[PDB]
Amino acid sequence: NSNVVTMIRAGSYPKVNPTPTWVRAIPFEVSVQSGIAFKVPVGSLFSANFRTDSFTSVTVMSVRAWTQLTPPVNEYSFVRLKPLFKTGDSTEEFEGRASNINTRASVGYRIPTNLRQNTVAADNVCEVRSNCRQVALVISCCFN
Amino acid sequence: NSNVVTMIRAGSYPKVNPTPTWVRAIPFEVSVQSGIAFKVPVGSLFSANFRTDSFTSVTVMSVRAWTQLTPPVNEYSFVRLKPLFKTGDSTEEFEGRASNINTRASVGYRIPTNLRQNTVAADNVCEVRSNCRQVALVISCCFN
Amino acid sequence: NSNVVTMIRAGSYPKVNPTPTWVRAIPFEVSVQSGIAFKVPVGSLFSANFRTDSFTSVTVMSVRAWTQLTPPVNEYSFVRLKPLFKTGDSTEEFEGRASNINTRASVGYRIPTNLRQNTVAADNVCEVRSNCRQVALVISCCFN
Amino acid sequence: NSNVVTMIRAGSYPKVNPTPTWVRAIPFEVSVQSGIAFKVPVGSLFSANFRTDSFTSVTVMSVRAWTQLTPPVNEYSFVRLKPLFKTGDSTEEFEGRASNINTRASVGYRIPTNLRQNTVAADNVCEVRSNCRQVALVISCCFN
Amino acid sequence: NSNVVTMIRAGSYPKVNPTPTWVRAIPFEVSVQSGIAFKVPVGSLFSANFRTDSFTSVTVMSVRAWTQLTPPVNEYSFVRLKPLFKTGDSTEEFEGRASNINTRASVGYRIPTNLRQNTVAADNVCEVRSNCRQVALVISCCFN
Amino acid sequence: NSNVVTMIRAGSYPKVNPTPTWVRAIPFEVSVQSGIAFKVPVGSLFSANFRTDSFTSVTVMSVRAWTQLTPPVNEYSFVRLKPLFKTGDSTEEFEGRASNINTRASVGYRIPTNLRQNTVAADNVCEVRSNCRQVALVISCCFN
Amino acid sequence: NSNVVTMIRAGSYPKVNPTPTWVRAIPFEVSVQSGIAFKVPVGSLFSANFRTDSFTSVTVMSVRAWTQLTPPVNEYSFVRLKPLFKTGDSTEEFEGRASNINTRASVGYRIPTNLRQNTVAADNVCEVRSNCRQVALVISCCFN
RNA sequence: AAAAAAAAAA
RNA sequence: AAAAAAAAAA
RNA sequence: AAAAAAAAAA
RNA sequence: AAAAAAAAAA
RNA sequence: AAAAAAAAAA
RNA sequence: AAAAAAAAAA
RNA sequence: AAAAAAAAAA
RNA sequence: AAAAAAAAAA
RNA sequence: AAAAAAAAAA
RNA sequence: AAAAAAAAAA
RNA sequence: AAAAAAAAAA
RNA sequence: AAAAAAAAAA
RNA sequence: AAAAAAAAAA
RNA sequence: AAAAAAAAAA
Ligand SMILES: [Mg+2]
Ligand SMILES: [Mg+2]
Question: Which of D143, F16, F19, G116 has its CA 20 to 30 A from that of F58?
Fold first, then answer.
């Protein structure tokens, strides 16, 4: 390959976009209480911590969750996800449980193409339930 | 395809990165004076206007330039690029000229793999010369 | 095949969901008045009569309608469907007519993937018009 | 694919059923005492918690069990299942044991076609034995 | 081919629709001010001038824009499009620039299937920015 | 497929037409008297009820007719069509009869390419005769 | 297949045996002391608990052992098996050790065809040694 | 990958 | 997938 | 290995 | 016959 | 399955 | 798809 | 056309 | 020779 | 293995 | 050249 | 059409 | 894609 | 013989 | 020999 700078025979000015879209896998944690569902805010996806503070909308594709702290004594960890949507919330409770007391419980869900619209900060992604005080989420989405 | 939310049989917690790299084509303009070279600052690449204010380093791959305003009376536009490098500046003057007085002049250069290291805000990319008061640049780079 | 109970070499605890989705064909009737459009409520889809009272949302895929009572004297039955959507109602009037005075008139419409979002009890599916006092609907949908 | 609503050339009124059958995997827990067998009631399968309260009968296909709490000190978890049938109870004691003290014990059994008849709330599925105070069951069945 | 009228052996009365959908490419202009974004109203798509006054909803598929008047002295034309959506506005600024001062600048964007829902008169399609006082749009859509 | 908005590399301004042609199947009814021919006016094809009020001309391709009300006592329905043309009316009487007293009679005719010219509101399509007080027409035409 | 009882064209009285042989995998536990070998009695294989109380002889094919309780503090479990035979005891000490302190240690041995003779209650199968107070055995044998 | 239940298509 | 024991079929 | 987003090449 | 949802198997 | 009209792609 | 009547073409 | 029940044949 | 139950192997 | 009667499927 | 919408044919 | 970055699948 | 000049490799 | 830099051609 | 109109057949 070349070891020096070389000329580029540029043509006309191209189509440009200073603020493009971005497909990402965003990791963040949420605090969870015993027997109570926690509504995950879409606003958590927009942050300088993820280089996404310039976005105001996002299209969520999938959600994965893991328990982030140990479970109560004698128990195995569990985590549940209930998808939420502006056009109508679901009543599914996708659940994962650990089979070793020292291991994380995990589960996830995919959003179908027909339900992949935008969401803003004030919207919620899903409800999280667990016997662990913290849950780690990894959300696959398209910032736009 | 599916019309409803479906379960994802998630496994162990994956490797994650909240602040990934980003390959981009960044468009911006610079002011140019007659007979004077303008040093293009790398700092112009880091801005909320490009969603890149969270980065402090960038690896430039190629630089393309176009005249952005009309040339002086009776003249055809021209633009020249002189690559700059922290390990030693080049003396090449890659030039493009218009063949129609109403059209932009354009030129570019590719940086070879061996010279693709990082640059920070205080560094300069290249020197620009033109008979036009403004030059539009489109820089292909890897933010990291 | 086996005539006795046999062991299952079960492994780790699986992913579970006590409240899954359900693809259905829901039959119900609506009362219709001469020259007046009847707005079909989505709420009619949630009922113990269909085993769907545990759901609060549904994604409608297609709607089919049949006249359920005889038409006025000297006439042939007819039924019209006008799709309704939260993002904007349609002005289509899909119509079917009977070709035998003693036979039902029928028609239907398919909702495209891009318009297959959720609906809740307070929403309406479509407007029904007919010269018959009752119309029988069969709605293909995904409860979630 | 289509982006708009389209007509369906519906024919005669079809055969319908407002209350269909449903093949499911039902997860629930039972409390177990040391040295005592717990009779699992079929009634636990009918609940609004599973969207099955509209059913009064079910055909069980298979039963899987996991210990749901930690075992006594110095021990490895174990779980046993004894199939029960209205025409004659079995004396099999299908057992699983953990090989790591921190892991669940698991086992299951399949019901042969010849023994797949209906069961009602007052009937029992099987007897559960364990050294753990709770057992998690996942029953594969056909609600009708 | 036949030179006279011929009989058609018609059967039963067909399914009919007096008010069908219509796929179109709608051309219209908007006034634009220096440094200010113009919100393009969906209402502009419904007009007797396009034979679309009978529609109240439309599904936009793509938007293309061209500068419609000459740019300021010494400049090249430019046009920018920022997609707007009821579920969340985008922050993309798709841009085109002219490479000849006497030529139009142009750009466009495609709406993905998952975001192709209906819009009504009060909704907005996108924001337009330009250095030209007028922009000509051609919107590909499905009236319904 | 894409889940986000994407750029379109638009070129020059295309050829456009705000008021295009439209191929349609138009359904409407006419009142018919015993032993009297009813001249079907072309004007009935132009109406807001069909989204065609912006057109003033139409090219008819084919005409189909069905009896729309029951026939007199003891009789079977019948319908006759006599094509009319500005350059010379036909004397054909294309006829259909029912073979069941409760069923519609139907018939149609195709206009040959050589006779497919435009017609305006004041023109007539055909003459209708029937023993039924109403006839339902479905006219295949090209609005222009 | 048949849904009713059907005739069997039986012939002469067959050879019969009310008390047949049985190939089994028998699970049972033994108590073990630190630094002391435990002689496993063959008599443990004959019990109503295994449905084998009607047998007085058995041919052992293989022996597998697992530690059944946790090991002493700071240690990994271990289990050793020394085969015993009426014609001459072996001096082999087949051993397994755990590689995780929370996991069972396991080992086994196969008896060659030439040493597969019968054993009665008063005979011993093998000697067991372990640092765990209990060992779980699974013996593959032929009851006769 | 096949099969069973609900749905859709053919 | 083959083999051994019980059973069934051929 | 294919696909989607950004980029580059053709 | 294929596909989508629940389940089962591989 | 082909064709005509509107649209999109190539 | 073939044939018969009128017409046209070859 | 195959299968199940009764019968017949082989 | 195949299948079902228990076991073993792969 | 085919056929006849009843049934089921196609 | 394929596809989507309206129409026509098969 | 291939490749690089982010993502998804296998 | 080939060739000429400088360089590198073979 | 291929490749890299400058040039030329296609 | 094909096609168009009327008829008949398939
Ligand atoms: Mg009848
Ligand atoms: Mg471990």
Answer: F16
The DSSP secondary-structure symbol of D115 reads G
Q: Please give the DSSP secondary-structure letter assigned to residue C87.
A: T
Q: Is C4 on the interface with D (CB under 8 A)?
A: yes
Q: Residue length, chain E?
A: 144
Cα–Cα distance for residue pair E110/D9, rounded to 1 Å: 32
Q: Do D10 and C106 form a contact (C-beta atoms < 8 A)? A: yes
What one-character DSSP code corresponds to residue E6?
Answer: E
Torsion sign, CA atoms B5, B8, B13, B17:
negative
Q: Report which secondary-structure segment, H or E, holds G39.
A: strand G38-41
- Considering only CB atoms, C88 lies closest to which of E16, E57, E114, namely E57
Report the separation in Å between the CA atom of F95 and the middle of ligand 1, taken as the mean of its atom positions.
Answer: 22
- Compute the distance between CA of residue G76 and CA of residue G73 in angstroms, rounded to an integer: 9
- Please check whether residue C91 is in contact with residue E19, taking contact to mean a CB–CB distance below 8 angstroms: yes
Chains E, B in contact, 3 or more Cβ pairs below 8 Å: yes
In sequence order, the 6+-apart residues with CB closer than 8 A to the CB of G86 are: G117, G119, G123
The answer to whether B120 touches B57, Cβ cutoff 8 Å, is yes
Would the CB atoms of G66 and D100 count as touching at under 8 Å?
no
Number of domains in chain B: 1
In terms of Cα–Cα distance, which of E100, G144, F61, C31 is closest to B100? E100
Mention every residue, 6+ apart, whose C-beta is less than 8 A from residue D1: C112, C113, E113
Residue type, A109: Y
Rounded Cα–Cα distance for residues C71 and F70 (Å): 12
C100 touches chain F (CB under 8 A): yes
Distance between start and end Cα atoms, chain C = 37
C94 touches chain E (CB under 8 A): yes
State the Cα–Cα distance between residues G48 and G70, nearest whole angstrom: 29
In the block, residue with structure tokens 């709608």: E26
Find out whether D133 and D79 touch, Cβ atoms under 8 Å.
Answer: no
CB D79 within 8 A of CB D65: yes
CA D22/CA F55 separation, integer angstroms:
55
Which residues of chain A lie closer than 8 angstroms to E89, CB-CB?
56-57, 118
Alpha-carbon distance values, A129 to A33, A74, A81, A126, E18 (Å) = 8, 19, 7, 10, 52
Nearest to C4 by CA among B38, E117, D88: D88
D73-96 burial, b for 16+ CB within 10 Å, e for fewer?
Answer: eebbbbbbbbbbbeeeebebebbb
Sheet holding F58-67, edge to edge: E6-8, F106-110, F58-67, F134-143, F22-31
Q: What is the DSSP letter of B43?
A: G
Nearest C-alpha neighbor of D139 from the set D74, D59, D19, D37:
D59
Closest alpha carbon to A86 in E86, E126, F4, F5? E86
Best CA proximity match to B122, nearest among B44, B47, B64, B65: B44
Indicate the SS3 state at residue B97. Answer: strand
| Containing structural domain, residue E101 | 1-144
Q: Which helix (H) or strand (E) holds C28?
A: strand C22-31
- Contact A108/A43 with Cβ under 8 angstroms? no
Contact between E144 and E137 (Cβ < 8 Å): no
Output the domain CATH number for residue C87.
2.60.120.220
What was the resolution (in A) of this experimentally determined structure?
A: 1.5
Task: Specify the residue for token string 């339900």.
Answer: A115
User: What is the Å distance from ligand 1's center to F97 Cα?
Assistant: 16
CA-based radius of gyration for chain D? 20
Amino acid at A94: F
Q: What is the largest CA-CA distance in chain E?
A: 70
Q: How far is the CA of F100 from the centre of ligand 1 (A)?
A: 7
User: Encoding tokens for residue C24?
Assistant: 């259905």
The two tokens of residue B99 are 């063949």
3-state class of D114 per DSSP?
A: helix
CB-CB neighbours of A125 under 10 Å:
23
